[PDB]
Design an enzyme around this catalytic site. Structure first.
Site, short mmCIF file in Angstrom:
data_model
loop_
_atom_site.label_atom_id
_atom_site.label_comp_id
_atom_site.label_asym_id
_atom_site.label_seq_id
_atom_site.Cartn_x
_atom_site.Cartn_y
_atom_site.Cartn_z
CG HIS A 46 -5.46 52.41 -94.87
ND1 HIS A 46 -5.52 51.31 -94.05
CD2 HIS A 46 -4.32 52.30 -95.58
CE1 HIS A 46 -4.46 50.55 -94.26
NE2 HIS A 46 -3.71 51.13 -95.19
CG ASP A 97 -8.67 50.79 -92.64
OD1 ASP A 97 -9.01 51.19 -93.78
OD2 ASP A 97 -7.47 50.56 -92.35
N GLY A 196 2.03 47.35 -97.08
CA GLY A 196 1.76 46.55 -98.27
C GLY A 196 0.84 45.36 -98.01
C1 9X9 Z 1 6.83 53.46 -88.61
O1 9X9 Z 1 6.86 53.12 -89.98
C2 9X9 Z 1 5.81 52.33 -90.32
N1 9X9 Z 1 5.50 52.20 -91.61
C3 9X9 Z 1 4.44 51.38 -92.01
C4 9X9 Z 1 3.67 50.70 -91.07
C5 9X9 Z 1 2.59 49.89 -91.41
N2 9X9 Z 1 2.30 48.86 -90.62
C6 9X9 Z 1 1.25 48.04 -90.84
C7 9X9 Z 1 1.08 46.99 -89.94
O2 9X9 Z 1 0.25 46.11 -90.15
N3 9X9 Z 1 1.92 46.87 -88.89
C8 9X9 Z 1 1.93 45.86 -88.01
N4 9X9 Z 1 1.09 44.80 -88.14
N5 9X9 Z 1 2.78 45.88 -86.99
C9 9X9 Z 1 0.47 48.26 -91.99
N6 9X9 Z 1 -0.56 47.45 -92.25
N7 9X9 Z 1 0.75 49.29 -92.82
C10 9X9 Z 1 1.79 50.11 -92.53
N8 9X9 Z 1 2.09 51.15 -93.32
C11 9X9 Z 1 4.01 50.86 -89.74
N9 9X9 Z 1 5.09 51.68 -89.39
#
Ligand code: 9X9
Length: 245
Positions: A46, A97, A196
């Site tokens: 992704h 992914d 990130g």
């Molecule tokens: C609701 O807003 C929002 N923005 C970004 C993410 C997000 N989360 C993870 C992620 O690992 N989340 C997690 N481990 N809880 C990720 N790898 N990439 C992401 N863009 C999640 N929510």
């Protein structure tokens, strides 16, 4: 990484920092990855899907800081960017992914191991540690969900593996999570991966050996109650990795 601690590349020497060149020449961070052999970095599909062209990317090994050249780092072009042909994205969840980047320097060489650059072993087939095992995640992702900036210093933390059963519960992810995904989280939900951190390593000790068990993929928010990080389950993709390396 939400919570956790700052670190340097010496502690996670398989960690790969992946950047993209923009139209105009500005260079920005994209995603983490992991060195699985001298010529191969593994990451998440992704991360690249909006910009599939391999000439747009730069990979650093041995790098501890986001926008400064760490002493001892190596720089690579991407000679082969292999996205998983069965990748798909729903509203939240990403499927298959996983991505492979073949790296080669401007001198035409693969990674040279050092104190700051090492490979990480793959698990054996369908061999994961038991739920509740502690594993470490590493990356340059946001330190708080509301941050605009990424941290300049590399970070790591520890999360525990969660069962498919528990992760299937209604107030978790329901059917969004599949058997080719692994869930990991803090018991207090106080530390997690975030935006990130995608593509970076979830590393566990298995048979007393450090093993690339997961790749940061997605989650609903970061460090939210009942919302684990979701990782590509590396032990379920070994045929794909073998066939493509
Ligand atoms: C609701 O807003 C929002 N923005 C970004 C993410 C997000 N989360 C993870 C992620 O690992 N989340 C997690 N481990 N809880 C990720 N790898 N990439 C992401 N863009 C999640 N929510």
């Amino acid at each position: 990484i939400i919570g956790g601690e700052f670190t340097t590349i010496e502690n996670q020497p398989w960690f790969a920092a992946i950047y993209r060149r923009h139209r105009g020449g500005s260079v920005t961070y994209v995603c983490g990855g992991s060195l699985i052999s001298p010529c191969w970095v593994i990451s998440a599909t992704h991360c690249f899907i909006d910009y599939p062209k391999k000439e747009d990317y730069i990979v650093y090994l041995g790098r501890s800081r986001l926008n400064s050249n760490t002493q001892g780092e190596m720089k690579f072009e991407v000679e082969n960017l292999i996205l998983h042909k069965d990748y798909s994205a729903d509203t939240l969840a990403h499927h298959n992914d996983i991505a492979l980047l073949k790296i080669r320097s401007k001198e035409g060489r693969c990674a040279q191991p050092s104190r700051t650059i090492q490979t990480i072993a793959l698990p054996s087939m369908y061999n994961d540690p038991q739920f509740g095992t502690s594993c470490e995640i590493t990356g340059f992702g946001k330190e708080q969900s509301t941050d605009y900036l990424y941290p300049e210093q590399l970070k790591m933390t520890v999360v525990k593996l969660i069962s498919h059963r528990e992760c299937q519960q209604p107030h978790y992810y329901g059917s969004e999570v599949t058997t080719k995904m692994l869930c990991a989280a803090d018991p207090q939900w106080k530390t997690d991966s975030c935006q990130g951190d995608s593509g970076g390593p979830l590393v566990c000790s298995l048979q007393g050996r450090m093993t690339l068990t997961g790749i940061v993929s997605w989650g609903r928010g970061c460090a939210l109650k009942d919302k684990p990080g979701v990782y590509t389950r590396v032990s379920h993709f070994l045929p794909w990795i073998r066939s493509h390396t």
